[PDB]
Amino acid sequence: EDPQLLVRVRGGQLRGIRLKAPGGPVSAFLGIPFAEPPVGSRRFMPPEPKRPWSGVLDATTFQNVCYQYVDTLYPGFEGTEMWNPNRELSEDCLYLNVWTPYPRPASPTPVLIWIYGGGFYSGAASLDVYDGRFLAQVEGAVLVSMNYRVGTFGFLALPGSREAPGNVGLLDQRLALQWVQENIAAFGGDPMSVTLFGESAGAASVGMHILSLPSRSLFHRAVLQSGTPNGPWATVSAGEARRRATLLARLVGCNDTELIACLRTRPAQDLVDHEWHVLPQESIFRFSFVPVVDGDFLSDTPEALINTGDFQDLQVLVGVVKDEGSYFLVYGVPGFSKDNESLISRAQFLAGVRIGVPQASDLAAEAVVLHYTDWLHPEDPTHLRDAMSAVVGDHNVVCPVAQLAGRLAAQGARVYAYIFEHRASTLTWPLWMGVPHGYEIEFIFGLPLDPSLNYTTEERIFAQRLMKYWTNFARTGDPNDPRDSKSPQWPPYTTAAQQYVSLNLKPLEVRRGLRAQTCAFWNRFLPKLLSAT
Template sequence: MRHTVLVVFTLLFEYVICTGPLINVHEGQLKGKQFLSRNGRNFFAFQGIPYAKPPVGQLRFKAPEPIGPWKGVLNATSEPSMCIQKNLFLYQTSNVLLGSEDCLYLNVYTPKLPKIGVKNLPVMVWIPGGGFSSGHGGMRLYGPKYLMDKDVVLVTINYRIGILGFLSTEDDILPGNYGLKDQVLALRWVQDNISKFGGDNKKVTLFGESAGGASVGLHLLSPLSKGLFHKAILQSGSPFCSWAVLPPGLAERRAKAVATITGCPPNSEDMIDCLRLLPADTFVQLHRNFFEWEVHPSVTFSAVVEKCKDKKDSFLCNYPL
């Protein structure tokens, strides 16, 4: 009997190693892979999981829409594209672009898959920084190998940045805060699915650095984020930073400047129709036109206070101070 159990366990282990772990989430089935932590502990990685429809075409400059179900097994064994951006360290000297507009993906890392009778682990959701114009949740910047030595499930996310993530005319047509609404949808996905990875959706800590830290603080204030996380860690950024939320009128002026440069009409309805026809790289290349000291030289498109009357999808209704 002992030999039979050993053989079955060995075959099961080899199956997981060769085929990758399979998990069923609400949208379908995922295939992941295994890594080793810093101290040699096995953990499971599920990378490039879509949590929203690609924000392209008519979904550009719009709140994200949840991803629908997929057929078959989704291969979650490679990192997703980052949201389209320039290299932060070569911003003024290079026109090379990184990433794609189709970028609303997240990664889940867990040291333990769920088992009957075993408590699920606390969850940490990482929001990367980058001045709301660069950054991503990939392993190159934010690898999981340190945290996977601990009993915690880690989630890292991508969200829209720059003009594509934060353009606003401060009205109901182009309300802004799309990148922050991406984060909200990712948190909803975590609530719905993280138990499948051995995580406890009642023990979610949201943490981030720089613009990610400011984002965490804004989630503490947003009605959309209520109940989606339970603890917060802000690192090198807060909603009280001068650049975190633009003052009244500035976002609208910058949006109209974008329209002027691209040859689009200045009124919101015609502007959004025109801007949706332009290639995504246009907006990344335009970003450098707005480096100025009015608020902060490198954070030019960020959160805005929305018109919240009778609107259930408004992220921020009041200034932090």
């Protein structure tokens, strides 16, 4: 037996597996339980630490995926299926995965912890695009990723109740973070250098660990890709969460205690079947069961917490892709399809806006339409299509990111910002969607280094650059290569200069102002307008 693949953790012994990366072997420990299975009476409850086990636990394979909705928009299409569960569904899903170099690091190595996205309703740490072997082999990183409960199972809340207090999926993440503190040194990981990174809902989660004190002692740096804790979709008020929960109960034939008891008798798929039916309006980029402002995990709204927080000892890397909104349009806006160029009329654009900005009053929706219309080409379908994408991307991601970056920088944080502008040569979505939400991930994780994936050689060089930025950020809080003696360097984002860089096949270019004018509209004007309409 290979002693490199044998680790003792607090819970007992486990056996990992030696995997091939293009440049060498890595050690992988997959399917490690970090919690008691949250099943039966444990449904909707906070996670509890996994009890110890006898003998040697088999950690050579990915564990089940947390119970979730499965996308059927384009059955069998690679672009959608790549996000779908790639293992069996189960509520027994609280496991994490660790990749280290082979052999085990001689000295304590910086840890990256990945938190998957998926709108808080889906996702899994076992997807191919989250494969940690490349970062492990090439950058010598210790990489961790955990499953956490999504949908009703992770976020259904009757605020105040003992049996569905909300945010349990965030607690799953936190428990995993605790597990890393207590165990990662056994793998050669350094618990004094832990960097969280995540995309979309994963980024929002990272943001919430920043804004929740008990998490703060479990990591040192953060990366938020295309997602924030502030903004329109990442959280709900207690009242809205309570509302969605009792509506769901009503929908499945179900006093908090009684209501939750009856929900607990329901087969998992019965809950999933009605998950989407509780949203207050017809919308896109909106998810039924998400973190709730409980006054506990989140002591106040993310907006309020970023405004008043002290972030002096924090380093954050945040960024967006070129076309944040395009992906979501095919999931609710009439006129949009992956199978044509989605050229839309003016009427369709106005209709699309009420759906993309579902909380907007008539006047607010009018403001949006008039801001985004190109008055030189008010009825041009190509521009109306691209504007619809921009409305969704800006409202949900770009402007919330700009707001976050600004508050963090102003309040002591060291911040680096990017925009990712390279569209994968292997992308299966149409050209009109550009660089869609989620398609920087395969580059950060270094998938183009696998020659069987048919990425171009420029893309391989690109991926290697990104892996260096991310790992260097993990190691130091500064994504700049300490061996690169060339201008330009990646400068910190500040409120004065507002510098950020473009990530693409060309060398780093420095830009100023992350949609400054348009985000002033979203971040400064619209709230005034809503609180008056």
